[PDB]
Amino acid sequence: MNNSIKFHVSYDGTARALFNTKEQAEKYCLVEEINDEMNGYKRKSWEEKLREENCASVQDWVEKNYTSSYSDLFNICEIEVSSAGQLVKIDNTEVDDFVENCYGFTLEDDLEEFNKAKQYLQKFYAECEN
């Protein structure tokens, strides 16, 4: 029985990626969001910030002072993934509870709905990594 810990990062409803380290996951999302901003609106401002902050890369700027574009809209949750890849538990909670809690369906009441929710929740994690 092998267990692995992954940090699920959810931004704007979409997932950013999966990782096992704070600076690894945080810098992954932080460089991703800012890059989107670099479309040309705040790109000039961001380029100035990196240089002014004396940072070769945005990733350096994260681990450096652990600061960067970050709003309360940011949603993070920890998940557990089997060494085989199969999901076993998420958010220190059995996904079985999540499906009944959000979908309002019970296995006995409608196992058909349960399976849908179970596979629906798996996609959020396996597909989170895009």
Side-chain angles (χ1 to χ4, degrees), residues 25 34 56 71 83 121:
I34 62 100
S71 167
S83 64
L121 267 82

Side-chain angles (χ1 to χ4, degrees), residues 22 27 44 47 60 73 76 81 96 102 111-112 119:
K22 153 160 61 179
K27 81 186 201 298
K44 179 65 175 180
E47 290 296 327
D60 289 346
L73 91 317
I76 54 171
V81 179
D96 187 349
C102 185
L111 65 103
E112 290 172 347
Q119 259 297 140

Side-chain angles (χ1 to χ4, degrees), residues 60-83:
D60 289 346
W61 179 233
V62 177
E63 182 177 0
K64 265 266 190 292
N65 300 121
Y66 196 65
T67 55
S68 267
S69 60
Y70 192 92
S71 167
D72 60 358
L73 91 317
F74 202 74
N75 190 36
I76 54 171
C77 182
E78 300 181 60
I79 62 170
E80 181 179 359
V81 179
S82 181
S83 64

Side-chain angles (χ1 to χ4, degrees), residues 45-56:
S45 294
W46 287 114
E47 290 296 327
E48 182 178 0
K49 181 179 180 180
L50 267 289
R51 181 172 293 176
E52 181 178 58
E53 298 279 1
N54 192 340
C55 299

Side-chain angles (χ1 to χ4, degrees), residues 19-130:
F19 290 104
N20 210 348
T21 336
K22 153 160 61 179
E23 287 82 4
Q24 186 177 0
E26 290 297 322
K27 81 186 201 298
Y28 188 92
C29 180
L30 287 170
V31 304
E32 243 69 71
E33 182 180 0
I34 62 100
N35 286 338
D36 185 352
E37 290 172 348
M38 289 173 70
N39 191 288
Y41 190 66
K42 281 180 168 63
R43 186 186 69 190
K44 179 65 175 180
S45 294
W46 287 114
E47 290 296 327
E48 182 178 0
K49 181 179 180 180
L50 267 289
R51 181 172 293 176
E52 181 178 58
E53 298 279 1
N54 192 340
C55 299
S57 299
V58 170
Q59 290 172 331
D60 289 346
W61 179 233
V62 177
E63 182 177 0
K64 265 266 190 292
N65 300 121
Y66 196 65
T67 55
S68 267
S69 60
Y70 192 92
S71 167
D72 60 358
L73 91 317
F74 202 74
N75 190 36
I76 54 171
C77 182
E78 300 181 60
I79 62 170
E80 181 179 359
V81 179
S82 181
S83 64
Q86 302 300 303
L87 264 72
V88 175
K89 201 175 190 179
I90 75 96
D91 196 14
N92 200 35
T93 301
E94 269 277 280
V95 282
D96 187 349
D97 193 16
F98 272 48
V99 295
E100 60 179 52
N101 288 341
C102 185
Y103 224 132
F105 290 85
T106 305
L107 177 135
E108 181 174 0
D109 289 346
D110 198 351
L111 65 103
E112 290 172 347
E113 293 291 343
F114 174 87
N115 289 285
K116 180 177 180 294
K118 182 119 276 95
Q119 259 297 140
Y120 195 61
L121 267 82
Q122 181 141 224
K123 290 198 179 70
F124 282 114
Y125 307 114
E127 202 273 333
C128 138
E129 216 275 330
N130 273 328

